[PDB]
Design a protein around this nucleic acid. Structure first.
Lengths: 205, 129, 123, 54, 157, 82, 80
RNA sequence: CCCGCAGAAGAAGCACCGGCUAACUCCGUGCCAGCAGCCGCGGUAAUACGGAGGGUGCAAGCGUUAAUCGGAAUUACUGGGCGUAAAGCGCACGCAGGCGGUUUGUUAAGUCAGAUGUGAAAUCCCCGGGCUCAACCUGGGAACUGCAUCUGAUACUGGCAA
RNA sequence: UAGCUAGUAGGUGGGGUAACGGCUCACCUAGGCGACGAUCCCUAGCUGGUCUGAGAGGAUGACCAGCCACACUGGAACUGA
C-alpha cells in the first residue's frame, strides 16, 4: 500500500525532481536524473501520446505518494465537484494531510510526513489524527503533539523547509510547531509545471 | 404529393440560397406568412409580400451577406409523418443560441427564445442556422 | 427505416451466440479424460499439440488443449477445463487448468507460474 | 455424403469382413509436408516488430 | 510560435517492372495556438524528406478559426470523403477528448475543451479534412450578428 | 393495532431507529405507513438526533395508535426538554 | 363531472349489450409517433336500443356479467 | 478508545515488456519444444517461445475464465443505408392502414400552461452531520422524466359546419 | 403457431358469496375472441431498483424493501376476524 522502493528510480523515470528524497544535497550529485532506470536507460523512447498521458499521471501520483485506487477515487471526486476538474484534482491532492504536514514543514518528504502522521504525532483541531489521506479543510490548525514535539527531525525539517519555497494557502508557526490551513490552493499557487489536462484526458478514455 | 407545404417553403428558401437567387416565390398561406414574419424579425430574410387575391402568392426577398447566403442551414423538424411537441423547458437551442427554432406556441408562432421567455411550449416547426 | 415501418415491426436485437457452449455459462467445468492424444495444427504452423477428448459433467464430450510443456494426463483423469479457443487447432475450444484436480503444474517454470499452476520456488 | 469407395468398403465389411484400414499403412503422428524456409520477398515484407518511422 | 504535430507516417508502394518501390507519405498539422490551423500531406522516398515536405505544405495553407477561451462556439459537424466528425463545446476544465488525428488538430489549433466523436471511416487524412471543414464552418456570435444585422445581445436576449 | 415503534437501521454497533408508524403485525423493518421521526442513541453532544412531529403523532393516537414503550419514553423526553 | 369514455359501437348482437371501440391516441414510447390504438369494451346497453355504427358515451360501473362492467349513459350521433 | 513496554523490529507479491499497449537485452531451442485476444511468432544471432538480468503496470492483492453493457452509428428513436460494396417487389390496381391544397366559424381530443392528488421507503444526485479519514450511517432537499382530475390558451394537428 | 371458444357470449329467474359476477343450475338468444396477434409452443416470479452508457437505450432483477405463489406430490375442507 506504499511504494517503499528506490525513489530516485521513480524520479529519473519521470526525468524530473519529484522532491521525494530531501533537499539537503543536489539530486544530480545523488544520482543521474537525466537518464532512465535500468539497462537501456541511456536510449530514449519516442513516447506516443498514451505514453505522455501515462507519464504525466504517474508523475503526479509518485509526487504525492498516492496509489491508483485512491487516485482514481480522487479523479471521481474531482469530476463530481463543480468547476475545473483538473484544478479540483490538484486541490484535492494538496488537501491531503501528509502533504499538508510536508508543506508546513514537519517532515523532510511526503514519506517522512506520512510516517509522522501515521505514528500519531499530528493533531488537527486538538484531536490526534492517524490517517494520511485526511482531507484538511480551511481554518484547520494542524499541530504536533507534545509527545513528539521535542524531536530532532522536525527541527531539521523546518530548517530545510524554510530553504524550500514557502506556500501561501497556509501559515506556519515553527515556535509552537503548528499551522493554519488558510484556503483551498488554487491552480496558479502550486507548482506550475504539471499538466492536469493530461490526467483528465487519460481517465476520460 | 405535396403534403408538407411548410417543408416545401423551407426547401424553396434553401434552394434559392444555394442557387444565389435574389427572391423566391411560392403559394401562400397564413402559416407561411407567420413563418416569414418570424424570419424577417430575426433577420434571415429581407422582406416578404403577398400578391394574389384568391390564389395568393408569397414572395420572399432572400438575404445575402458579403460573400454568401445568410440562411446557412434550414431544417424541417415536425414533419407530417412525425409531429414533435416540446414543453417549455425542453425547447432546444439551435447552434447554441445563435440560430433560432421556430416554435408554433399556443399564442402564436414565434422563436424558441421568445417561447422560453413567455413560458410556454408547443410544436417545433423548423430549425434555422 | 420509416417510422411507420418500425412501428409495424421493430429493430431486431441481432445474435447472442457463445463460443464456449459446453461450459454452460460456468467458468470452469471438470471432466474425465476419455483420450489424451496429439494432433496437428493448421496451414502456417506445423507443430504437435497435446489435446484430450474430455467428457464433462454436463455430458458433453469436447476436445480441450493442454498448455505448458509436458503433462501427466492419461485415460480416466479428472481435469478442469476453462474455456478459450486455441486458434490453429481444428475444433479445440477449451483449455485445461494446469494445477487443478488431476493435472500437475508445468515443471521447471519460473515466469508466469500463476497461469500454469506452478507454486513459487521457496528458495 | 459418404464416398462410393467407402460404401463398397462397408458392404464388403458387412459381408464377411476384413477391415482393410488395418492393412493400410500407418501414417506418422506428425505432418509430412514440404517445409521451405522463406524467400527474400517474404522476409523483406514480413513487417515484424512494427517499429515506427523517424 | 507555430507548434506542429506529426500524425501518421505511412509506407506506400508502386509496382514497377523490376519490383516494388516503397515511398513514405507523412501527414502533419501546424497551428499557432490561437485560432490558426493548417494541415499538410507530404510524400517522398525517405521519412524525414516526407516530414519536411509535409511541414512546409502545412505551414502555407493554414486557415483561420474563431473560438472561445479554449472552446468551440457551438456543436458543429465536419464531413469529408469518408468521415463524419462531430465536435461540441465543453465546460472549462475538461481536456480535448477526440481520437488520434482529431486530437492533433485540436491540440495545435488552440482548442482545449471539446467533446468530439468521429463517425464513419477514421482514416487520418479524411478525419483531418473533416475536422478542418468543421472548424472552418463554425460561425461566431459576432459574425452571425453581422450576418443578421443586429447585436450579440440582440441574438442572446 | 397500528403501532408507533422504532425501525432499526444503521451500521453494526451503530444503530439508528426511525420512529415510524406501521401495522403491528408486519416486520420490524418492513411495510410502514409513514415515518414520524427518528432517534440516534449514540448521536453526539450538541449535534442531537431525536425528532418527532408531535402533531402527526397526536393525529395517530387520536386515530387509535398504540405507542411502544421506547417511543413513548422519547415523547416524554422531548416534551419535557422541548 | 364524472368520468365518461366516448366510443363507437362495433357490434350489438348479443342482448341488452354492445361492443364499443374506444380509440386512444398515444405517443409511441420508442419512435415518437402518435399512433391510433383501439380498446374494445363490452358495455351494458340498457333497453337494447343502440345500433351498430354509432357513437356512445359510456361510464364504468358494477360488474354485470363475466365481462361487461361498463354501461351506456347517453348516445351522440346515431348511425345513418 | 486512551496510556505504558521492547525493538527495524513480526509483515510483498502478481501479471506484463512484437504492434494494438506503458516497458528490452543476453543465453538456451531450431516450423521443435512451444506462445496466441487479433495480426501472427519459432526454418540458427527470436526485443513474440523457456530462463536470466533489467524494466513497466497494479498492489494484499494480481491474473485467467464465465457473463453483461460499452466501444458497435455493427438493428441507426436520438443515429445507417438500398446504380456498381448486402439491399427497389417483374409490373400495376386496390381494401385495412399512414399522410393531407386553402379560407372562415366552432370544439378543445392531440398539444401547451398552472394547480391538485399520487409517483412507498431505501438506492441515484445536491447541501449538510456523525463514525480519527474513507467506505458506511444519516438530516433536509431535488428527482421519480409517469398517470388521473380541475381551470385556462388554442397557434399547429384532429373532429364538425360552410 | 391462424383460427379459437357451447357455460362458450349475453339475457331472465332460482341458488350461492362478506361482496358484484356464468360463481353455479334451468330456459332463451347465437353469440364472444382474433392480424392492435386470439390460440398454441418455449421461457420466465414482478417492481423500487442494479450494471453499463453522453443520453436514448441495452442486459438484469442476487443483498435490501413492496407484491405474488409454494410448503414431499395430488386433492379437499375444517377452525377462525
Amino acid at each position: 500500500a506504499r511504494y517503499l522502493g528506490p525513489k530516485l528510480k521513480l524520479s529519473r523515470r519521470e526525468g524530473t525532481d519529484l522532491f521525494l528524497k530531501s533537499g539537503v544535497r543536489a539530486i544530480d550529485t545523488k544520482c543521474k536524473i537525466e537518464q532512465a532506470p535500468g539497462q537501456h536507460g541511456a536510449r530514449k523512447p519516442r513516447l506516443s501520446d498514451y505514453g505522455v498521458q501515462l507519464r504525466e499521471k504517474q508523475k503526479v501520483r509518485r509526487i504525492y505518494g498516492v496509489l491508483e485506487r485512491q487516485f482514481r477515487n480522487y479523479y471521481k471526486e474531482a469530476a463530481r465537484l463543480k468547476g475545473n476538474t483538473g484544478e479540483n484534482l490538484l486541490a484535492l491532492l494538496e488537501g491531503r494531510l501528509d502533504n499538508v504536514v510536508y508543506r508546513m514543514g514537519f517532515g523532510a518528504t511526503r514519506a517522512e510526513a506520512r510516517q509522522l502522521v501515521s505514528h500519531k504525532a499530528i493533531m488537527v483541531n486538538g484531536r490526534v489524527v492517524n490517517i494520511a489521506s485526511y482531507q484538511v479543510s480551511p481554518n484547520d490548525v494542524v499541530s504536533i503533539r507534545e509527545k513528539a514535539k521535542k524531536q530532532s527531525r522536525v527541527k531539521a525539517a523546518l530548517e530545510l523547509a524554510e530553504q524550500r519555497e514557502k506556500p501561501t494557502w497556509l501559515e506556519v508557526d515553527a515556535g509552537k510547531m503548528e499551522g493554519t490551513f488558510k484556503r483551498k490552493p488554487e491552480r496558479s499557487d502550486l507548482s506550475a509545471d504539471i499538466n492536469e489536462h493530461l490526467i483528465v484526458e487519460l481517465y476520460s478514455k | 404529393s405535396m403534403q408538407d407545404p411548410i417543408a416545401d417553403m423551407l426547401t424553396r428558401i434553401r434552394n434559392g440560397q444555394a442557387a444565389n437567387k435574389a427572391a423566391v416565390t411560392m403559394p401562400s398561406s397564413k402559416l407561411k406568412v407567420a413563418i416569414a414574419n418570424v424570419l424577417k424579425e430575426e433577420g434571415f430574410i429581407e422582406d416578404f409580400k403577398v400578391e394574389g387575391d384568391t390564389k395568393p402568392e408569397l414572395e420572399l426577398t432572400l438575404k445575402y451577406f458579403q460573400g454568401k447566403a445568410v440562411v446557412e442551414s434550414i431544417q424541417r423538424v415536425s414533419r407530417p409523418g412525425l409531429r414533435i411537441y416540446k414543453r417549455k423547458d425542453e425547447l432546444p437551442k439551435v447552434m447554441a443560441g445563435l440560430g433560432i427554432a421556430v416554435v408554433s406556441t399556443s399564442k402564436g408562432v414565434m422563436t424558441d427564445r421568445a417561447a422560453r421567455q413567455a413560458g410556454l411550449g408547443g410544436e417545433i416547426i423548423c430549425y434555422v442556422a | 427505416a420509416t417510422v411507420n415501418q418500425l412501428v409495424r415491426k421493430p429493430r431486431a436485437r441481432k445474435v447472442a451466440k457463445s463460443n464456449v457452449p459446453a461450459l454452460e455459462a460456468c467458468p470452469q467445468k471438470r471432466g474425465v479424460c476419455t483420450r489424451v492424444y496429439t494432433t496437428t495444427p493448421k496451414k502456417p504452423n506445423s507443430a504437435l499439440r497435446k489435446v484430450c477428448r474430455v467428457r464433462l459433467t454436463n455430458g458433453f464430450e469436447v476436445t480441450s488443449y493442454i498448455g505448458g510443456e509436458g503433462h501427466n494426463l492419461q485415460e480416466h483423469s479428472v481435469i478442469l477445463i476453462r474455456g478459450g479457443r486455441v486458434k490453429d487447432l481444428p475444433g479445440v475450444r477449451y483449455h485445461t487448468v494446469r494445477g487443478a484436480l488431476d493435472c500437475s503444474g508445468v515443471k521447471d517454470r519460473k515466469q508466469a507460474r500463476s497461469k500454469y499452476g506452478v507454486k513459487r520456488p521457496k528458495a | 455424403a459418404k464416398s462410393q469407395a467407402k460404401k463398397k468398403r462397408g458392404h464388403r465389411l458387412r459381408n464377411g469382413g476384413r477391415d482393410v484400414l488395418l492393412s493400410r499403412g500407418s501414417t506418422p503422428s506428425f505432418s509430412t509436408h514440404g517445409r521451405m524456409t522463406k524467400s527474400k520477398k517474404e522476409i523483406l515484407n514480413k513487417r515484424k516488430h512494427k517499429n515506427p518511422y523517424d | 510560435e507555430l507548434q506542429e504535430k506529426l500524425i501518421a507516417v505511412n509506407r506506400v508502394s508502386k509496382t514497377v517492372k523490376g519490383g516494388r518501390i516503397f515511398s513514405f507519405t507523412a501527414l502533419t498539422v501546424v497551428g499557432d495556438g490561437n485560432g490558426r490551423v493548417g494541415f499538410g500531406y507530404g510524400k517522398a522516398r525517405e521519412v524525414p524528406a516526407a516530414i519536411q515536405k509535409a511541414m512546409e505544405k502545412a505551414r502555407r495553407n493554414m486557415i483561420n478559426v474563431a473560438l472561445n477561451n479554449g472552446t468551440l462556439q457551438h456543436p458543429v459537424k465536419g464531413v469529408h470523403t469518408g468521415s463524419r466528425v462531430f465536435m461540441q463545446p465543453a465546460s472549462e476544465g475538461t481536456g480535448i477528448i477526440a481520437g488520434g488525428a482529431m486530437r492533433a488538430v485540436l491540440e495545435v489549433a488552440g482548442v482545449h475543451n471539446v467533446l468530439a466523436k468521429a463517425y464513419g471511416s477514421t482514416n487520418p487524412i479524411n478525419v483531418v479534412r473533416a475536422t478542418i471543414d468543421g472548424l472552418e464552418n463554425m460561425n461566431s456570435p459576432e459574425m452571425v450578428a453581422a450576418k443578421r444585422g443586429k447585436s450579440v445581445e440582440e441574438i442572446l436576449g | 393495532m397500528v403501532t408507533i415503534r422504532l425501525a432499526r437501521h444503521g451500521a453494526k454497533k451503530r444503530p439508528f431507529y426511525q420512529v415510524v408508524v406501521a401495522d403491528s403485525r408486519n416486520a420490524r423493518n418492513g411495510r410502514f405507513i409513514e415515518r414520524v421521526g427518528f432517534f440516534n442513541p449514540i448521536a453526539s453532544e450538541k449535534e442531537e438526533g431525536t425528532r418527532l412531529d408531535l402533531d402527526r403523532i397526536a393525529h395517530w393516537v387520536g386515530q387509535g395508535a398504540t405507542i411502544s414503550d421506547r417511543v413513548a419514553a422519547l415523547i416524554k423526553e422531548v416534551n419535557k426538554a422541548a | 363531472k364524472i368520468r365518461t369514455l366516448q366510443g363507437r359501437v362495433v357490434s350489438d348482437k348479443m342482448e341488452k349489450s354492445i361492443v364499443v371501440a374506444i380509440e386512444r391516441f398515444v405517443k409511441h414510447p420508442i419512435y415518437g409517433k402518435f399512433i391510433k390504438r383501439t380498446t374494445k369494451l363490452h358495455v351494458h346497453d340498457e333497453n337494447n336500443e343502440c345500433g351498430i355504427g354509432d357513437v356512445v358515451e359510456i361510464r364504468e360501473c358494477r360488474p354485470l356479467s363475466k365481462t361487461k362492467s361498463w354501461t351506456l349513459v347517453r348516445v351522440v350521433e346515431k348511425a345513418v
